[PDB]
Design a protein around this ligand. Sequence first.
Ligand SMILES: [Cl-]
Ligand SMILES: [Cl-]
Ligand SMILES: [Mg+2]
Ligand SMILES: [Mg+2]
Ligand SMILES: [Mg+2]
Ligand SMILES: [Mg+2]
Ligand SMILES: [Mg+2]
Ligand SMILES: [Mg+2]
Ligand SMILES: [Mg+2]
Ligand SMILES: [Mg+2]
Ligand SMILES: [Mg+2]
Ligand SMILES: [Mg+2]
Ligand SMILES: [Mg+2]
Ligand SMILES: [Mg+2]
Ligand SMILES: [Mg+2]
Ligand SMILES: [Mg+2]
Ligand SMILES: [Mg+2]
Ligand SMILES: [Mg+2]
Ligand SMILES: [Mg+2]
Ligand SMILES: [Mg+2]
Ligand SMILES: [Mg+2]
Ligand SMILES: [Mg+2]
Ligand SMILES: [Mg+2]
Ligand SMILES: [Mg+2]
Lengths: 61, 385, 133
Amino acid sequence: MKVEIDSFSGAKIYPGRGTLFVRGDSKIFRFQNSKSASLFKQRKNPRRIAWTVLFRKHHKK
Amino acid sequence: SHRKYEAPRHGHLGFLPRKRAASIRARVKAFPKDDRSKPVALTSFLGYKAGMTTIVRDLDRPGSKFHKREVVEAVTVVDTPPVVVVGVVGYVETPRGLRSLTTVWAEHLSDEVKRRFYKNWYKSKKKAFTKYSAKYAQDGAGIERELARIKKYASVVRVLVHTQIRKTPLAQKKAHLAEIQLNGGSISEKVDWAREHFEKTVAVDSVFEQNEMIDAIAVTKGHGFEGVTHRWGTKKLPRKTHRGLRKVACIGAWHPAHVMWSVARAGQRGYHSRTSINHKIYRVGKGDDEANGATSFDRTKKTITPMGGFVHYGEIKNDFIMVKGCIPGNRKRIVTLRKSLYTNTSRKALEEVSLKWIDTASKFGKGRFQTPAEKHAFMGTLKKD
Amino acid sequence: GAQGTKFRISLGLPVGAIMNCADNSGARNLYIIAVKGSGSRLNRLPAASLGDMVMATVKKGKPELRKKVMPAIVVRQAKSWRRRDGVFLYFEDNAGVIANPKGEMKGSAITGPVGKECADLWPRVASNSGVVV
RNA sequence: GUGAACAGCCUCUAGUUGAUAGAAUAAUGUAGAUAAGGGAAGUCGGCAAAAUAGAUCCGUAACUUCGGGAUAAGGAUUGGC
RNA sequence: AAGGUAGCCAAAUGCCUCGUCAUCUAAUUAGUGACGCGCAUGAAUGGAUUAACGAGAUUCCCACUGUCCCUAUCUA
RNA sequence: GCAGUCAAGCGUUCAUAGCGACAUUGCUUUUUGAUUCUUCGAUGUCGGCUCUUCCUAUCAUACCGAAGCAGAAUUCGGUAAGCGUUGGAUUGUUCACCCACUAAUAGGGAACGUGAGCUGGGUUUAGACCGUCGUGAGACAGGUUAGUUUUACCCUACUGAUGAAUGUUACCGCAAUAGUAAUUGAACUUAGUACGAGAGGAACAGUUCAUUCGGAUAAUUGGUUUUUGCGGCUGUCUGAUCAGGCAUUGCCGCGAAGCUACCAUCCGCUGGAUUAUGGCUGAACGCCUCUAAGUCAGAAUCCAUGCUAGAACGCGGUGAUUUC
Ligand SMILES: [Cl-]
Ligand SMILES: [Cl-]
Ligand SMILES: [Mg+2]
Ligand SMILES: [Mg+2]
Ligand SMILES: [Mg+2]
Ligand SMILES: [Mg+2]
Ligand SMILES: [Mg+2]
Ligand SMILES: [Mg+2]
Ligand SMILES: [Mg+2]
Ligand SMILES: [Mg+2]
Ligand SMILES: [Mg+2]
Ligand SMILES: [Mg+2]
Ligand SMILES: [Mg+2]
Ligand SMILES: [Mg+2]
Ligand SMILES: [Mg+2]
Ligand SMILES: [Mg+2]
Ligand SMILES: [Mg+2]
Ligand SMILES: [Mg+2]
Ligand SMILES: [Mg+2]
Ligand SMILES: [Mg+2]
Ligand SMILES: [Mg+2]
Ligand SMILES: [Mg+2]
Ligand SMILES: [Mg+2]
Ligand SMILES: [Mg+2]
């Protein structure tokens, strides 16, 4: 098998978990759950969401 | 006049009546045909449904698009601690059907089985089988006399077994007693096999094996009184409908001047006996084996129990059977697993299954980690520790 | 002229749905009036999914393609479906391409992604498709 | 107090706390709600429901009894400090 | 006694009739525009046309939606 | 409306492959008439929607016979109602007419099934308009518009649910009877093969999926939110702060558990006896004949296997059976 990475939060995605989204520009997005998928659809910036991997990297947590 | 348009009937008329089952333990109404030229073995086993999970495996199916490619499948786990043999029963053929002739019990019975014979166990004097045990106090002529009668007259032999309910995380403490038919060997061999196994345990791996099709017999989940719309799947009436719309508009013609048995009516839904066939075994699990949930590819040291335990059930500390797909009945319910009644060779059976990965994430939410070690490695140190 | 079979995909385009035109035939949208190979059940609308062949009419585009019935093939689906590898996926819109009954495309180019199921079933769609999934 | 406001919503003075009760949470209802993808294919009929909504700025057709049509249509903005 | 003029129409008025042609639709006994020997249109028993107005009768389009595909769930 | 008999002729030749004039015998009550027996101290009246069952004069599917059946396609007929027979535009429509999918879009009954099941568009109260008719009040199986759809708590039927009495009580079983279920298609391959001058163009076995239906199930995905679980936001109130009340669940985002969806996943068994039909042996009738005696193979048919219920007046095995 292969473990994926959430496109919004950076959480590992095991087989069968979450959903895969293909945008009009043929770019693939992966989400571990509907929480990050909903935040992605609301046009939220991952770097401003405190519990994401990108936020912790930016603030050196 | 004839109906304007044709449509198939709603519901199946062979599963009538839709009433509550007589007992919570579903009856086994048929056993596989006996082959006398084989060693004596059990034909069914008892267990408790724990929950469901997910596995990943390669598909071995030439001609399919997903041949030699990974697929994701749902499985059901049944907790199956060893059963204890506590008696035997002989049956005689009669023009009026099979008739039980004699029952012989073991000398000693644990409190688990004795609780089955009481409704008020805490107040009872616990006198059950006290006088019967005296039949063993002598040389055993009384016990030997009844065993000879079974050998001489009986044509079908079954053994009385009970589960070890104390080994499960359940709170019942009262064991389930059932009859299991013995197939293989002559009548004398069946009786001798039963006699030697008195007060002994029979493990699940001695009954079933890997890649074997089995049948599941259980009572379905109950839902109480239900309307026709969900009980039978009839079409909902328009929004304009006066006096309600979750009904059947016409329940019968003028003649015959009666409501017919084939018309959908509101009533009990669920808690029915069901027999589902052709379920393939994916894994026969060992209780004392660490890394139950490990495969030859994953190689991590983890049991079959998901993080936080099975929801509403608990942990799996005994042997288990992994069954592809879903099984009738809900969690914590006693189920009966039976061997198939025919030799299936549709190439869906006979396929060798090798698991690659077993999901052990928490089923109490959107679980993200297979093991506690994975969570610690991903998150690092916390304020708690 | 399907080149094989297709595992079942969730239906999301019943009769009456309008999807975008993904080729350069001059049409802008497709109005679905039927689905090839659909079954029969009282009150149930025929519905199509990725890789299905439908009968459609062009509602906006070149007038020479309007007011007539022509076959079409769905290449993108907004309704989520599960593949046999356990992945639920969906596209941003519904799109189709004009084809003849034999499966040959009327246009010569496809814009946007194309589902893997559609490409395998229809070789001509795969030839004119740039990126698959 | 909010706000254009005798609107809706909350409060002071004053006045009530009256309408048979307890337990449980089946079906079917009455009343109030939400729904993936499609979008009137439902139906005699878009019935019912949904969408729109205040204010400021921009922009506004045919026709016309020249008074209108007009908030036509169609866009942008709105907190706190 | 005079023989339907100016107009208007398969119109809420046409039996035959789902009239004929065009338009609208994948497909229309519907709608609209034309045609008129009009069973049985027609001039204060008022004819024809009309901006604005209408809890009036109709057709189509956009938006919108559990009306429907096909049902599910929650509260009193 | 449907089905026979006869056979002048049609069919290049050839009555009866498929048709069939002039005549003639029937069947049906899904047409409309004829009649006026039942109901006027009232049996709710058109169509649609919903739902069950029945009939076969069979559209499709199974197995066959026949052809002017080379193949492909089609046509006629037999056993067969087991299993299906749809989505839309216009019309109140029954009917009709087109578009399209499909293996196929067969015809009918059940008080012209079904209004204390719905709906109320039409017809068929009272308002109003038009045309023709009438001096007029008014008429029109002509058109047009607006017009209250009541009651079940009783008996039975049906769906589920308890239960006295068979020494008491408990556990494990038997199976009389009743019910019963699966369905159809495509692609690959067979095969560009058989067949055919050519054009064209199969089938059995095997494989992979799908359609309609059924029974379950909730690992996953999606829906649902009084977890009023966490966070955010407006107005007002508690002096401020903290933390809260009210706005009939204030509103918004996320949201476990439970429930739930061809919007999710899993599963849906194989033996016997036969129908049509094709045969064996074989008389009647020295020959000949599937039939008379006997007998073989045979259908989506039937009976079982399997599946559901368990007679509350059908039955068996086994445990323990009380002293103030
Ligand atoms: Cl049935
Ligand atoms: Cl309710
Ligand atoms: Mg269901
Ligand atoms: Mg009503
Ligand atoms: Mg869970
Ligand atoms: Mg929706
Ligand atoms: Mg949506
Ligand atoms: Mg319509
Ligand atoms: Mg309709
Ligand atoms: Mg309205
Ligand atoms: Mg006229
Ligand atoms: Mg006109
Ligand atoms: Mg005059
Ligand atoms: Mg008389
Ligand atoms: Mg009556
Ligand atoms: Mg009456
Ligand atoms: Mg009637
Ligand atoms: Mg009524
Ligand atoms: Mg009635
Ligand atoms: Mg009645
Ligand atoms: Mg009316
Ligand atoms: Mg009137
Ligand atoms: Mg009413
Ligand atoms: Mg009984």
